[PDB]
């Protein structure tokens, strides 16, 4: 029971072609201890900006499904950030960092014609939260087949 607002109810009932966008506010794996530095990724295509930060839109190919039944079950997701982005893979495989903590918040923003249609009644009328969890993640899978296309995806696990 998230009240979802009557405006969002009407939009979901009528519009029938809604451009879903996810707002991933990652917290960077940081070493030696400092203030938290956040990378703001989104799936969409343009650059969807919610309440300040711009949420860059050049990564995160897909997001897993949030499967959680009536049993506390370490509810887990998994990003898929392209492994051809030097910055992300570098932050992944740098030796010295530890990221036991570091929140991941995903906002599943229902894009309006021009910029988010104001659901979530208690919160400032923005998108529903989607995960709001912690990052306990894996890493690269490279293929570089000699025949042709190979894939490379960062599988950021989070639970």
């Amino acid at each position: 029971m998230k009240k979802i607002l009557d405006s969002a109810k009407n939009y979901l009932n009528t519009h029938d072609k809604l451009k879903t966008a996810c707002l991933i506010a990652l917290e960077l794996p940081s070493s030696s201890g400092s203030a938290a530095t956040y990378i703001y990724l989104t799936d969409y295509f343009r650059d969807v900006t919610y309440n300040g930060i711009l949420y860059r839109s050049g990564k995160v190919k897909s997001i897993s499904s949030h499967k959680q039944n009536r049993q506390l079950s370490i509810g887990s997701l998994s990003f898929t950030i392209t492994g051809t982005a030097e910055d992300e893979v570098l932050k992944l495989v740098q030796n010295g960092v530890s990221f036991l903590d570091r929140g991941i918040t995903i906002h599943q923003a229902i894009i309006n014609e021009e910029g988010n249609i104001l659901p979530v009644d208690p919160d400032t009328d923005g998108p529903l939260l989607f995960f709001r969890g912690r990052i306990t993640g894996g890493g690269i899978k490279d293929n570089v087949n000699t025949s042709g296309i190979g894939t490379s995806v960062i599988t950021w696990n989070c639970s």
């Binding site: 201890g33 992944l92 530890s98 903590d101 993640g137 894996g138 570089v144 696990n157």
Partner: protein, 158 residues
């Protein structure tokens, strides 16, 4: 029965010498029960990494007792080249320099970092300084926990 001919003696001796590299951390002066730890004759060095004293109750199983010893000193038995070749964890300046271009195309990375890394450890000994009664060793780390985010997470051991 392993016939003692399936072992290569030279690397077995090498790994045994890897085990008994002197631990310049403590001193023999502060070992009260020097004898019942299991080294004879004070003055001699006796400060060796992994100085395990074993009970092998022969009622459990061969498999489980052997894996218990291996978990104790840290290692594995590996009949890869046809010989058992008991290896142990080590650091050395002569490794193999494997470049990615050499291997093949597939390369999996898997950080099991959420569950399998810790900031403080707790241990459990059968201490001769307690008349063979359980004793607990614990640390904390200011570097590690500050690296994490100030999250308390203890490794537990016996």
């Amino acid at each position: 029965d392993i016939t003692l001919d399936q072992f290569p003696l030279q690397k077995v001796i090498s790994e045994a010498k890897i085990l008994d590299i002197i631990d310049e951390s403590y001193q023999t002066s502060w070992q009260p029960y020097w004898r019942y730890v299991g080294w004879n004759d004070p003055l001699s060095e006796n400060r060796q990494i992994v100085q395990l004293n074993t009970i092998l109750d022969t009622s459990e199983s061969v498999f489980k007792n052997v894996q218990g010893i291996l978990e104790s000193f840290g290692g594995a038995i590996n009949n890869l080249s046809g010989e058992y070749r008991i290896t142990v964890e080590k650091y050395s300046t002569n490794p193999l320099r494997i470049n990615f271009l050499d291997t093949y195309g597939d390369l999996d990375l898997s950080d099991t970092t959420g569950r399998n890394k810790f900031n403080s450890v707790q241990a459990s000994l059968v201490d001769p300084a307690l008349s063979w009664k359980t004793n607990s060793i614990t640390f904390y780390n200011s570097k590690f926990k500050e690296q994490d985010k100030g999250l308390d997470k203890k490794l537990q051991l016996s």
